[PDB]
Amino acid sequence: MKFELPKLPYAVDALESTISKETIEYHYGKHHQTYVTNLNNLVEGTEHDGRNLEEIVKTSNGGIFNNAAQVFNHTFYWNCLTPNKTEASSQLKAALIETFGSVENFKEQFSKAAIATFGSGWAWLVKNTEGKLEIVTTSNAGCPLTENKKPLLTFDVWEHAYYIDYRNARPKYVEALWDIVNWQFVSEQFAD
Amino acid sequence: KFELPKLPYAVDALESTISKETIEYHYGKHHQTYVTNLNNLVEGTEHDGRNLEEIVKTSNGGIFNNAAQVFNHTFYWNCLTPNKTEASSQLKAALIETFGSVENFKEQFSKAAIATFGSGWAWLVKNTEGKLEIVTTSNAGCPLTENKKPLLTFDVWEHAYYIDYRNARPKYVEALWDIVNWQFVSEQFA
Numbered sequence A: 001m002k003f004e005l006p007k008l009p010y011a012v013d014a015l016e017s018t019i020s021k022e023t024i025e026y027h028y029g030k031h032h033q034t035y036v037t038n039l040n041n042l043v044e045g046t047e048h049d050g051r052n053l054e055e056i057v058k059t060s061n062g063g064i065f066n067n068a069a070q071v072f073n074h075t076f077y078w079n080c081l082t083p084n085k086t087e088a089s090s091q092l093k094a095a096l097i098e099t100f101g102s103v104e105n106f107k108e109q110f111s112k113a114a115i116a117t118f119g120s121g122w123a124w125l126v127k128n129t130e131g132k133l134e135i136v137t138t139s140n141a142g143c144p145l146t147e148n149k150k151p152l153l154t155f156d157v158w159e160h161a162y163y164i165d166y167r168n169a170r171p172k173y174v175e176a177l178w179d180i181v182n183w184q185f186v187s188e189q190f191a192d
Numbered sequence B: 001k002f003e004l005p006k007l008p009y010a011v012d013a014l015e016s017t018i019s020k021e022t023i024e025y026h027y028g029k030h031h032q033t034y035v036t037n038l039n040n041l042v043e044g045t046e047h048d049g050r051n052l053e054e055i056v057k058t059s060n061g062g063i064f065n066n067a068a069q070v071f072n073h074t075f076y077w078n079c080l081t082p083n084k085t086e087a088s089s090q091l092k093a094a095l096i097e098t099f100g101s102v103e104n105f106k107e108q109f110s111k112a113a114i115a116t117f118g119s120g121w122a123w124l125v126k127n128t129e130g131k132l133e134i135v136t137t138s139n140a141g142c143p144l145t146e147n148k149k150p151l152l153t154f155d156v157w158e159h160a161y162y163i164d165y166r167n168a169r170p171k172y173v174e175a176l177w178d179i180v181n182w183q184f185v186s187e188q189f190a
């Protein structure tokens, strides 16, 4: 039928001081909503009308893709953040240590990848089909589902994600995000 | 050796279309960072003591990104003005032949600017058949790399407008016409 904007998993000011109420107002309430509205408008009456969002992401192009992948990516992003205390599962910890040397090394690499992404895009931690962990960046609406990789964590690095709160200082934004990373959600995605 | 070039007007001259705050970050930090980064990247390379336009036409990766952004932002600042300007008759003529009318050009150009997904630029350019053309570019993309002649550009990277308009890119694009330097577009087109 129609896609809806998922309910935010916390209050609009739950992520202060890291992300401001105003950012959430715009980012969730306007940008993420616009993607949902556009997706519905574009899908209506096509073969994609009725398909699950992940299939649409995996199999569309043009405007449908851009809007589909952004709806997915933003929902994923809100689930990657939390005002609550969390920690990596023992299994996720062990995987991070074995792949990147330590949890802190992963954070360093991931932060660097996120800071270096040019233009609008996303930084991802993914699990490939062999179960291996990789850092993946995407441009614009790009989503690792289209490469058959399972997303575990994402940082939005489109300027709208940080401009209100950090202006051009993306590194400060990336650094601060670690304080609200939802390691429970990341761990749950890693499981399997 | 590359320098941030002087803005063609005071930092607050484009109010109310573009705020002094936007000029200070956009010009004073973003533009400057591209200049700085480029200087760092070109050093010890073949582009060291090569001109900006030659670097844009002949570089890839990080050098291209920083060089093309330097060029693109200087071009953009020259496309704006606090002063009253209008199109030369030859430019106006060319606009009417290609787009039907000046207003139709502005509609189409606005549509193009608004429709550009992600970060990028909308351009009016002169192509090899001597004709006018609207093209858009992603990220640092520049018409020089297609040997096309840029006449006007709007920056639609979110930093260009987010401070003054938040997500309302169409309001930004609409407001830009108030400050478009038709003398500069006409000189380029000469």
Ligand SMILES: [Fe+3]
Pocket (backbone or CB within 6 Å): A027, A031, A074, A156, A158, A160, A161
């Ligand atoms: Fe976003």
Ligand SMILES: [Fe+3]
Pocket (backbone or CB within 6 Å): B026, B030, B073, B155, B157, B159, B160
């Ligand atoms: Fe810019």
